[PDB]
Amino acid sequence: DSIQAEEWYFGKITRRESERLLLNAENPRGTFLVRESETVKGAYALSVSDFDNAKGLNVKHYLIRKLDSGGFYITSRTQFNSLQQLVAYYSKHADGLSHRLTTVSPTS
Structure with missing residues (x-):
């Protein structure tokens, strides 16, 4: 699954x-x-x-860094193999963010 296929990926x-x-x-x-x-x-x-x-x-903006060796993080101790895995993780618990991810942005 490429990031470009994901409804939350706005490029x-x-x-x-x-x-x-x-x-x-209206947005949760x-x-x-x-x-x-x-x-x-x-x-x-x-x-x-x-x-x-x-x-x-x-609106909160969190920087997702890319390791050239592979992988992504917002905090250095919490690394993911994909942006999809990062989204899933922060959808469960805030773990450092203001609030967990609840809702994919409407397209407005």
């Missing part, structure tokens, strides 16, 4: 575009997508709707 969308999709008040907390990183060439960003105690609705 080369901007950070601004990810926020426009995810700040929808933990609505998410994965995009190419605009900051680190070859990395990915996990963008996730959130509700903060002081700031209210917001």
